[model samples]
Target chain A: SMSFVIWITGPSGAGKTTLANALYKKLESMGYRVELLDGDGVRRKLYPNLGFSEEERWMHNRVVVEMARRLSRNGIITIVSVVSPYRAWREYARKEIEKFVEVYPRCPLEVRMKRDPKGLYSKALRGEIKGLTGLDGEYEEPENPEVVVDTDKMTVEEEVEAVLKKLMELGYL
Target chain B: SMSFVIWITGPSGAGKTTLANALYKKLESMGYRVELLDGDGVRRKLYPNLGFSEEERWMHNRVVVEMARRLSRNGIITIVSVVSPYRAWREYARKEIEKFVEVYPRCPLEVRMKRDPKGLYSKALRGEIKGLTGLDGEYEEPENPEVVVDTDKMTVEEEVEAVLKKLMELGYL
Candidate 1:
């Protein structure tokens, strides 16, 4: 049987990677073959020379979508955590993959900047980086995601449980 | 258990795709999860704007290698049939994948041009296209492939048997 893709989308420091890692570990602990694909790591490997322009970001999303589609079709539970800031990009992925679950890690920009887990916000405030999503650049929020976690209010464990519960309700677990 | 990647490399019209299809069928009939990735098809999906420059071709190979590596890691027998004309690309794939088999489908230029199964050779000759590998473009022959099939001499069934034998000997079958 084929597996599905868990696509997590949000702006920088919005807890997408955190939720993705937790979900991947949870799934793997349950004896399922799961793959965790983080946006920054995959970008470094596939498009190191590419900038954070709109065109480059879209291309990166396209490439990752193709990878996820192939993995899901091969019966691997693919977890993709990326700052996919465009609705069209997410729609494209949903159309391409047979079974897709879009998880939105929703957090206000102020809260995310305060956390700044990776210090990207601090660097952006110092004028070090130009195209910081939700600051200088744009972040198109998801219109109708399968699940939404208020990362600013929920704990990581609670968020993971929410996703797992939803997956089961949808018959994917 | 982990699955392996079968990397089939050669010039255009070198029977790489044919042999890859046969091998995929043979392996799938044995109840293995298999995936076939062809060069032109993936390039059309991922890098449609790219040209035939060395840099572009290398980048294409790198993308395909990444896809194949991910599929194989997820326990899929990934069969990659591409005209990867560089040793460095194949070496990179070998380093990334846990189990990799490099199969070279060797065929002389005259034989391939005469066959021209895809009509690409005739198009190149008529000036409709450029940078045809083994003709106007370059094709770096493999120095040490795991398996080599003389496409001009061997029958398709024989080629498939040889590959299956090698796979069994390598503990992959």
Candidate 2:
């Protein structure tokens, strides 16, 4: 019913993209103009040079928030899925964008490593990569997000519903 | 009216952004959703790390086309002002975007150097910066653009009208 930004933040393999995509589809099907800015997809396609370092993640998050804010201002609901591991960067996004909703997709590091959806966790375990966010314990959990979907316990349907319900309660839908 | 992309390409002092901004305001006044993506502004804000090498130019052009295409597909009349020097990149944009209008703002290098709106030309001439686009003659001119505005020969108002006329002729308006 209104233009907004739903940011799904968590560590890798924590179902951020899955939940964001599910939420995007549900919102679009309800006839809202929707755009999905996925961290993995944007990195792979738009900015492959942006590495996984702390500074690089900050740069990537800045770009993500700029894009989502632009779209939201133009009357499109933007859904962002990123392993935004910094509280300051997330706070910056929340302050910059109107009707911003931060959804924490929480899953344990053990469960995420077991899931290893993109093989990133296994690569980190095998020493192919260093300083993986969750495994390295670098991910800063949101202190008071608008919604917390326990990704390990809930189905994607439930997660989407949780986000949608929060949006409704916030008068965004 | 239909959502389309107006890519204004030329050297830096050729009045691309001036004309794009004017056209953007005009279109928005006509009740069209318009977004202006300028090269200098985007580089200063979104991707400061992207430098001016040919490879960097290619990367930046790719990002510009991707952003313009995304906005156009979302029903925004996107106006892009960039000194996208490569013919291949412009061709890629034209092919990828629907109803793409390439407007070439032509100005002599001597005149551009004298004007030097951003002082980039002066910097390049003073050896403060190397490989400036128009002075280096690296800008590959568009062969068959939808519109060509001789920026030195016309005012900003006339340039905007020229673009609008072309868009009308192409049935984008």
Candidate 3:
């Protein structure tokens, strides 16, 4: 029960969830105690008191990282999919998690805009909202991630394969 | 692995921690994935914003219950040792945790005052604090606790045996 955390982080519409779900299935089929923690499902129940301000997001990441630590220590493979857009907390997670694999879903803002499933991108472009994570500022890059999903070029299958291969190389498989 | 939860609850100095720590060691030596989650350690990391009022306590217990739910579902035997002074939240925890086994560490207030490990009761008695949970108001009782550790009468060994027997009867062993 080595809870390998495949923490997929990126701007919204950058395929974090897609990659996480695919990888989750692959890991589950391989018999690791895998669980996918997507932002949509995990957000409401966790840190309800914390706001979306920069500070709150930092605290939110801490809580999520704390849960990840607990789950993984108990041998649950946790695939954490969130737009954890800050490097500070992400790095904190890296230091905190014993079995961490940072997966960056790297896609351009233009690419993400066209691929917006929630239409947040279209609204953000039109100033209907504060705009995309990339719109506000460049999504803080992972200093050096364990894996990168080049969504602009790679198919979802290819992306998942890359992660699986990385996990294998890292001895998780 | 359906992780069994041995939830120990009562007023301060009711021997909840002492009993929990003993059982924790027993379960561990048996090779169970046992963990003791006392409130002091658990609260700082979870529901970090909630106050100490009865209403906030309700919210706090839910958060703890949710984590316990997640951990036990994945087969980590969790020992939750806390005073959990309200029946509302304690019962809330009971309903939320599957494979739950409630253990009340029952000890008299007179005895607890003398054994005030934290001096909480000592201050409460001296009017420095509005002390006893049973003084100003009756601590809500669990109508049907699974096990009761009467520390006033039972030895630590006896209490541990009582819990082990309960666990066996419940088919956890």
In model 2, how large is the Cα lDDT of residue B125?
A: 78
TM-score of chain B of 3: 0.89
TM-score of chain A of each: 0.91, 0.89, 0.88
State which candidate, 2 or 3, has the greater lDDT.
Answer: 2
Q: Which stretches of candidate 3 lie over 4 Å from their true place?
A: A46-50, A117-134, B46-50, B53-55, B123-138
**For candidate 1, lDDT tens digit of each residue in A105-141?**
9998789877974697564665434563437367788
The CA lDDT at B6 in model 3 is: 86
User: Candidate 1, what DockQ?
Assistant: 0.76
Q: Alpha carbon lDDT of residue B156, candidate 1?
A: 94
Tens digit of per-residue lDDT, candidate 3, span B1-173: 67778888888778888898999899889988876677656677654664677656655576567667778888889888876777777777877787889898888888877777778876776788673575554676778899987898999989999999999999976
- Model 3's DockQ score: 0.47
Each candidate's chain B TM-score? Answer: 0.94, 0.92, 0.89
Cα lDDT, model 3, residue B8? 86
Pairs with steric clashes in candidate 3: A1-A75
| Per-residue lDDT of candidate 2, residues A1-173 (tens digit) | 23799998887788988888788788878887788998767767766765667676677787788778777777888999987888998999998898899999988877887787469756576543447353656778999999998988999999988888898899887
DockQ values of all predictions: 0.76, 0.47, 0.47
Residue B20 of model 3 has an lDDT of 89
